[PDB]
Amino acid sequence: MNTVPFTSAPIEVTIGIDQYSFNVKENQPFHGIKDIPIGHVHVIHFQHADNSSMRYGYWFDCRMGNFYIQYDPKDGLYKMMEERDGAKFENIVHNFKERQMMVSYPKIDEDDTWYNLTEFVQMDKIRKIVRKDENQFSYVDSSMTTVQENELSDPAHSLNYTVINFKSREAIRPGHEMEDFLDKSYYLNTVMLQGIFKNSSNYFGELQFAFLNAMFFGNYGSSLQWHAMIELICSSATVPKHMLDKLDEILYYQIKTLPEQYSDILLNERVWNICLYSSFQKNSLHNTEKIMENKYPELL
């Protein structure tokens, strides 16, 4: 079990750790989060009490280093940093734990909600989508645009998701125009899976990372990416059977976790109705269709 200590909490802020959130008051004696499960990526995120604008946060994996949070009063935000002095870090954490100045990552011992949302998400791949190679953790916020959004403006601060565009020469083989537009299997299987992602695990990892960015920071571009990756599968007549079964599980847990009150804006009516009721895979997502119909029947 790993720990992310905080130097202090000088400004009132709502802090989230994965799917959990808690409030910290201005100058409250808060010194971080302990008992963080090893084996998963994690995200620690922030919304200031005085400017709910800009949710921001950091993706990290405690196996990759000792990380802490420190507020910067010049840049006005809580920053993640790496402590290279391992003995200094262990000493700091032990003192904060002895003084019980940390919230404990919940230890609910029955379901894998976070595992189920991050099954295919790897820190190495996050770091290729979010480029800042001198850090082992990755910063994301509400406003960051994607490389595709920038083609339609600061490249260093962009989300480099894989570009998916159904009306692109990459997606459409000369002479197979109708075939490739109406059945995207070529684009899914040859271009994207064999060619770019190499395997379905990496495809699902980016899909899951895009959803989490769309939900935790209200990142419009991440939302677009998540839906495009769903639609590319649902619009392919030929999809490996294990991929469909896994996609159904992935989406089920995503829909289950979504805040009920953010559904109106986080769920694209057109894509979901097409995917569940018109697409080649309309009958292949039983778990997802059942939770969607019972939880958001308005959208459909």
Partner 1 sequence: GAMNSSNYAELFNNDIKLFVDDTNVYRVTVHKTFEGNVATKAINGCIFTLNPKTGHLFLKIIHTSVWAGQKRLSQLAKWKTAEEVSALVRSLPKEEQPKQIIVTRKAMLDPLEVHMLDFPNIAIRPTELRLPFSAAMSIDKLSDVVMKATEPQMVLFNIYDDWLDRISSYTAFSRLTLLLRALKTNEESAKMILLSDPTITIKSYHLWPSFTDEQWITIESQMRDLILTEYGRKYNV
37 binds, among ligand V3F, partner 1, none (CB under 5 to 8 A by kind): none
Residue 270 lies near partner 1 (rule: CB under 8 A): no
Q: Which two tokens stand for residue 10?
A: 């000088």
Q: Rounded to 10 degrees, what is the CA torsion of 199, 203, 208, 213? A: 140
Residue 186 lies near partner 1 (rule: CB under 8 A): no
Residue 29 lies near ligand V3F (rule: CB under 6 A): no
Of 66, 146, 208, 223, which lies in the binding site for ligand V3F, with binding defined by CB under 6 A? 223
Q: What is the CA radius of gyration of the chain?
A: 21
Residue 25 lies near ligand V3F (rule: CB under 6 A): no
Task: Write out the DSSP string of 224-255.
Answer: HHHHHHHHHHHT-S---HHHHHHHHHHHHHHH
Contact 148, 221 (CB under 8 A): yes
Of 38, 49, 237, 265, which lies in the binding site for ligand V3F, with binding defined by CB under 6 A? 265
Of 84, 107, 169, 242, which lies in the binding site for partner 1, with binding defined by CB under 8 A? 169
Residue 193 and residue 282: Cα distance in Å, rounded?
21
Put residue 24 in one of left, alpha, beta given phi > 0 → left and psi -120 to 50 → alpha: beta
Residue with smaller CB distance to ligand V3F, 217 or 280: 217
Residue 1 lies near ligand V3F (rule: CB under 6 A): no
Residue 153, strand partner residues: none
Burial label for 272, CB within 10 Å (0-12, 13-18, 19+), is buried
Residue 103 lies near ligand V3F (rule: CB under 6 A): yes
Residue with smaller CB distance to partner 1, 169 or 241: 169
Q: Which stretch binds ligand V3F (CB under 6 A): 18-26, 40-48, 116-124, 163-171?
A: 18-26
Q: Which stretch binds ligand V3F (CB under 6 A): 46-54, 127-135, 172-180, 213-221?
A: 213-221
Contact 171, 180 (CB under 8 A): yes
Residue with smaller CB distance to partner 1, 175 or 259: 175
Residue 243 lies near partner 1 (rule: CB under 8 A): no
Number of helices and strands (H, E) in the chain?
12, 10
**Which residues bind to ligand V3F, rule: CB under 6 A?**
20-22, 103, 106, 214, 218-220, 223, 265-266
Binding residues for partner 1, rule: CB under 8 A, are 167-169, 172, 177-178, 181
